[PDB]
């Protein structure tokens, strides 16, 4: 018995590839506009006047219109002590993200094999990606049984990951894609604010910066090297990733698992940190590509908010068009965690369709994702994108 | 720019081989024939007979000699919260485990790299697996710091896996290596029972079974495909792997990660289950390779407890000394969970090569690793031994 040979027929041949994308939000819409009145009612902290006015002026700022959110003003009635800035309360909100996680993310990826249209028993791997909660068999197991998945479909359950975690399960499912002839990984990531959801707290404003950012979605992907001719239909390839650790990050954001739920903090400034740290980062990816001009390549950028945006444009040169369906995805949407990237991978293949262009990439050839978070770590992907 | 170019020249060639192998433990040494009057006096239980005679029965069935433990008695007195069955202490374990797992964890890490040989610059991917807790940034980052890793390594931070993830990480690394030209990954399951340890209670014996089996370690490996002739020694080659559900199991095995702590239910019998499906992921590994006779591969399983140990023996009629390694390990380490497969694979090459053995497999070409844990959940690995 050749190991050799083994090895040989094992491999698959070609560049790991998306080949659907299917997306799910709560339906409860929360416009930001009020948020802050409904808010400081809902946490009983309309006494506190300055507060408010500053938390007024985030949600203004934020450039977000609408966030999506499993938590409403009942289930929020029902646990004041996730309405306090910190009262025991995880396993409360522990309850609620071990159900919602993996029912959210099954809606996002009944979407994305409907779309794929190959029998879901053709699912090889699955990677399921959440900083919502925890639990023991995991989200990966309920979104096995809640598709009915085969019993042997070989999972990567991803937990506690954070914002930049929408890199991480491309670069993931690109090796499982490429190394295993035939395999076809389906990738679920899905994001419930209810164990960060929390009362504001005036001596803890970056605390209070989340409670204006993040909202709840779920999108999902179906990744698979060497797609059948016209029975699959690619959408984008990957070509490259890496990870990195920002110099002088130590510390910038953190999230602690705590019994009050998922806390946050900010402890630097993220916008400066990415946007001093992210030219490296392209010349890293595209400089072996013969590739200098950033504008003449696709992007998807994680929003964490949109400082970040600003000062990556303002830092490369980005015509104003580059982040445009990155912030779409953020106006629409907030801050979705390890979703947002794949949102607006879908919202830019989806526009560049519907408006006739030439690829998938918004008419380009190359194109970068780029993830951020805790670290302060930045995820870098560059595409390919696909004709049509 | 030509894709298929790019994608030939990034990858490796040959089978991903394990290239080092070190552990680590906390240095309390827990004797388990005095263990049920030591717990049940730390834990404040000696008016309950009936219940501490059933943990001396246990622990006198499990076959464990020792267990290490970062929990003392000094730790436990200035923890009652921890000590009661049931009571609000997450806050204090998390705060054990974010620091202890990742420093627990260089210490393998450390052992491994002086093994290897190679500059640390070198490792391009880590892994790390944990179900001791969880912190943004992960236990991953801080390893990264903590051994000076590159900035630039790309991270796999597994949480809240289970027992079976020692099976996980090494099918993770398997497709890293293999995917990777040049790629060289350390694989850290670092296992600490801080979050796990409660109190007694007579009404939940399946929690109880638990305070006889798991004990602390960490295990670390390099993982590489096409190592440098005569500068790094293979072990043992990767060939093939598999992650399955079995069938009936539905709830077998459970934790949740709450308030209280990690909490531990058993409600199937799973030395029954694990038996009952272990020949069929046997055919799916073996049958391709013609083999048949299982007495003829070496042996790793996660040794849950000894009955699972023994009711497979029973069930496909090895020979005892099948799984010594296994049980060598049991006996001097307890349940590690991640880990304890870890340890077996150094354990075994280690005797097979004092004792002047062929191959690091005890002498035998082909071996099987398995990992056993919620879902209920049976990961298989396949693997080839080295020469000497």
Known sequence: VSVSEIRKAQRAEGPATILAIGTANPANCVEQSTYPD????????????ELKEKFQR?????????????????????????CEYMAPSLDARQDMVVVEVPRLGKEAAVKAIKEWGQPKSKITHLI?????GVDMPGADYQLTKLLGLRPYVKRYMMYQQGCFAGGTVLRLAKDLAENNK??????????????????????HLDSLVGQALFGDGAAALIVGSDPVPEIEKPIFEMVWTAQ????????????????????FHLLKDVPGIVSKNITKALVEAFEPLGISD??????????????????????????????????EVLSEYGNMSSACVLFIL???????????????????EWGVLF???PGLTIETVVLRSVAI
């Open 244 to 263: 990195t650790i920002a110099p002088d990050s130590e510390g910038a954001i953190d999230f602690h698992l705590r019994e009050a739920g998922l806390t």
């Open 371 to 373: 993830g951020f978070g």
């Open 38 to 49: 409904f808010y400081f009612k809902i946490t009983n902290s309309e006494h506190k006047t």
């Open 128 to 132: 399921v990606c959440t900083t919502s």
């Open 294 to 327: 950033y504008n003449s390549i696709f992007w998807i950028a994680h929003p964490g908010g949109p400082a970040i945006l600003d000062q990556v444009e303002q830092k490369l040169a980005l015509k104003p068009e580059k982040m445009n369906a990155t912030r």
């Open 182 to 203: 035939g395999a076809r990984v389906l990738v679920v990531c899905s994001e419930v604010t209810a164990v960060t959801f929390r009362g504001p707290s005036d001596t």
């Open 58 to 82: 985030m949600c203004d700022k934020s450039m977000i219109k609408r966030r999506y959110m499993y938590l409403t003003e009942e289930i929020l009635k029902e646990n004041p002590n996730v």
């Open 346 to 364: 879908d919202e830019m293949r989806k526009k560049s369709t519907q408006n006739g262009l030439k690829t998938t990439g918004e008419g380009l």
